[PDB]
Amino acid sequence: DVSFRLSGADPRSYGMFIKDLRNALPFREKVYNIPLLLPSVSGAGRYLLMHLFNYDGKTITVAVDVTNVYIMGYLADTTSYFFNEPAAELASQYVFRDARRKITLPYSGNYERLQIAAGKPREKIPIGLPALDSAISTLLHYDSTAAAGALLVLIQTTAEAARFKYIEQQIQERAYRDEVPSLATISLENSWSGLSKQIQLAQGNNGIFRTPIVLVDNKGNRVQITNVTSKVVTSNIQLLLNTRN
């Protein structure tokens, strides 16, 4: 399992949690020095448990699919909550079995779907460590509209930070003050699958992308990624989604 405590959290402790999260995800190999997530994991081993504590010491346990860093669901006290998607229904056979009831949320974990359910796009939802304290507090007691926003904050501050060093650093900057995501943050989230595919295909194409990827850089400017010598590949991306997925 991995843990993060918002009480006494600072940029260093958040960075330690994200390092813990990345290191709990299994890989058999690296592509251009980046861990390659497994194509598949059978049974309970497919799920990682993340224990998150708000400033007040109240806790949720979040279940994460180690193939893609997707959040399946979470446990608050004696109630489990799962996204409305087949992988989450399967997860509910393995995790949070002892919960008194299991609520299926009225949406999948798809960003477009969560944004419709929250009533706001990611572009307008502040993120940061105080936002994560709020999100844990929201998820402790069911409110599906409130939960959609909380889950967009939770996914970006856990899974997306694990996938990109830049997003980790953006949340560290927001340790004590929330701010809507940077243009480069939204770009990287939207491009993880694409970048993962192009990095794996660059094995066999001399480190050249078969299809260049258009990103936003840390200054807010267009950068076109054509090959593996780019900073996005050498420093930023930390996990590759397997092209089998």
Ligand X SMILES: Nc1ncnc2c1ncn2[C@@H]1O[C@H](COP(=O)(O)OP(=O)(O)O)[C@@H](O)[C@H]1O
Ligand Y SMILES: *[C@@H]1O[C@H](CO)[C@@H](O)[C@H](O)[C@H]1NC(C)=O
| Residues noted as catalytic | 160
Based on the shown chain and the rule CB under 6 A, indicate whether residue 245 belongs to the binding site for ligand Y: no
Based on the shown chain and the rule CB under 6 A, indicate whether residue 70 belongs to the binding site for ligand X: yes
Q: Which residues, 33 to 62, sit near ligand Y by CB under 6 A?
A: none
With CB under 6 A as the contact rule, the residue among 184, 189, 197, 233 that binds ligand X is 189
Based on the shown chain and the rule CB under 6 A, indicate whether residue 229 belongs to the binding site for ligand Y: yes
70 contact choice in ligand Y, ligand X, none (CB below 5 to 8 Å, kind-dependent): ligand X
- Write down the least CB distance from residue 34 to ligand Y, Å: 16
With CB under 6 A as the contact rule, the residue among 67, 200, 230, 238 that binds ligand Y is 230
DSSP the chain: -EEEESTT--HHHHHHHHHHHHHHS-EEEEETTEEEE-S---GGGGEEEEEEE-TTS-EEEEEEETTTTEEEEEEETTEEEE-SSHHHHHHTTTSSTT-SEEEEPSS-S-HHHHHHHHTS-GGGS-BSHHHHHHHHHHHTS--HHHHHHHHHHHHIIIIIHHHBHHHHHHHHHTSSS-BPPPHHHHHHHHHHHHHHHHHHHHTTTTTEEEEEEEEE-TTS-EEEEEETTSHIIIIIB--B--TT-
Based on the shown chain and the rule CB under 6 A, indicate whether residue 74 belongs to the binding site for ligand X: no
Based on the shown chain and the rule CB under 6 A, indicate whether residue 63 belongs to the binding site for ligand X: no
Based on the shown chain and the rule CB under 6 A, indicate whether residue 242 belongs to the binding site for ligand Y: no
Both tokens assigned to 122? 């990611």
Based on the shown chain and the rule CB under 6 A, indicate whether residue 159 belongs to the binding site for ligand X: yes
Which residue's CB comes closest to ligand Y? 227
d(CA 153, CA 171): 11
- Write down the least CB distance from residue 231 to ligand Y, Å: 7
82 contact choice in ligand X, ligand Y, none (CB below 5 to 8 Å, kind-dependent): none
Could you tell me which stretch among 39-47, 108-116, 140-148, 175-183 binds ligand X (CB under 6 A)? 108-116
With CB under 6 A as the contact rule, the residue among 14, 83, 96, 166 that binds ligand X is 83
- Write down the least CB distance from residue 211 to ligand X, Å: 17
133 contact choice in ligand X, ligand Y, none (CB below 5 to 8 Å, kind-dependent): none
d(CA 189, CA 184): 9
User: Is residue 171 a contact partner of residue 147, using CB atoms and an 8 Å limit?
Assistant: no
Distances (CA, A) of 232 to 81, 131, 165, 205, 226: 34, 26, 9, 18, 11
110 contact choice in ligand X, ligand Y, none (CB below 5 to 8 Å, kind-dependent): ligand X
Which spans of this chain sit near ligand Y (rule: CB under 6 A)?
226-227, 229-230
Which spans of this chain sit near ligand X (rule: CB under 6 A)?
70-71, 83, 85, 108-111, 155, 159, 189
